[PDB]
Structures are given as structure tokens and as C-alpha cells.
């Protein structure tokens, strides 16, 4: 269920704490993040919001090991890795950076950074300006 919105983000983690200001947290211990049947295996994850000021907030994650699963629009499963992942609610996509890899039999992308557009073929090199 949604509005005319982004899908709900799901996180499974082993142990964490909650914020005394209710707005800045972390999720930790062999973590799974799930959205749109994308999977991300992680170790430490972040969610952070300004109480709803300007309606903008962000999601970040790191893994030891990290793995990024998706389906591809051509009806296939896919796997990969990256050193960090990031999302924000006006972007259509999730972005992965530092030491990144994703591959099908049809296509290979690896280097700095990965993004995948869940409607259009613009998976490309976009070599980076900060490991974050």
C-alpha cells in the first residue's frame, strides 16, 4: 500500500537504539533493507529526518559484506556489491558508491558508483567526487 508516493521502506536488523529526539537513528547487525523487491545486505544503516521540515529526509547504508540484489525489467534476478548506498524522496532511484559491482549475462557495470533506473536504460559510469 502507498499513496501516489514512494513505496514503504522495510528494514530487518539485530540490535539498535532509538533517538531521545525521535528524528536521528541507526539500524545494526547483519541488516537487510527491502524496497520494490530490491534487497540490500548490510551491517549498519541510517534514517534521518528534520521532523518533516521541507518534507525531506534521507536513507544511508554500509555492509561487511555488502550485497545489492534487484530484479531487472527484462524478467531476471541480479546481484552486486558497493561500499555505501543512499536514497532521498525525489530521485526515482537508489545510488551506490565506492568499490561497486553489478552483473547480468547481458551487462556488466563496476568501478566507482552504480545506479539503476527502474523504467529506462541509463546504467552508466559516473566516476565520483567523494566516497560517501
Amino acid at each position: 500500500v502507498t499513496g501516489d508516493t514512494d513505496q514503504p521502506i522495510h528494514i530487518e536488523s539485530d540490535q539498535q537504539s532509538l533517538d531521545m529526539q525521535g528524528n536521528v537513528v541507526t539500524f545494526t547487525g547483519n541488516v537487510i533493507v527491502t524496497l520494490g523487491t530490491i534487497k540490500i545486505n548490510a551491517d549498519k544503516v541510517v534514517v534521518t529526518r528534520p521532523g518533516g521540515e521541507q518534507g525531506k529526509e534521507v536513507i544511508d547504508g554500509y555492509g561487511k559484506p555488502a550485497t545489492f540484489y534487484q530484479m531487472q525489467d527484462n524478467g531476471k534476478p541480479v546481484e552486486g556489491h558497493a561500499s555505501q548506498m543512499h536514497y532521498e524522496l525525489a530521485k526515482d532511484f537508489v545510488v551506490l558508491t565506492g568499490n561497486a559491482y553489478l552483473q547480468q549475462v547481458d551487462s556488466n557495470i563496476k568501478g566507482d558508483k552504480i545506479t539503476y533506473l527502474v523504467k529506462e536504460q541509463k546504467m552508466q559510469a559516473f566516476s565520483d567526487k567523494g566516497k560517501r
Binding site: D6, H10, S13, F27, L89
Partner: peptide, 16 residues
Amino acid sequence: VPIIYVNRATXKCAAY
């Protein structure tokens, strides 16, 4: 965003 977080370590959940 609508968020849900769940413990692997207990099998129980909360929305954000």
C-alpha cells in the same frame, strides 16, 4: 517516507 523496521533478533516490528 513511510518506514517499517523489524528485529531479526525478536521477529517484531515498528513503523517510522
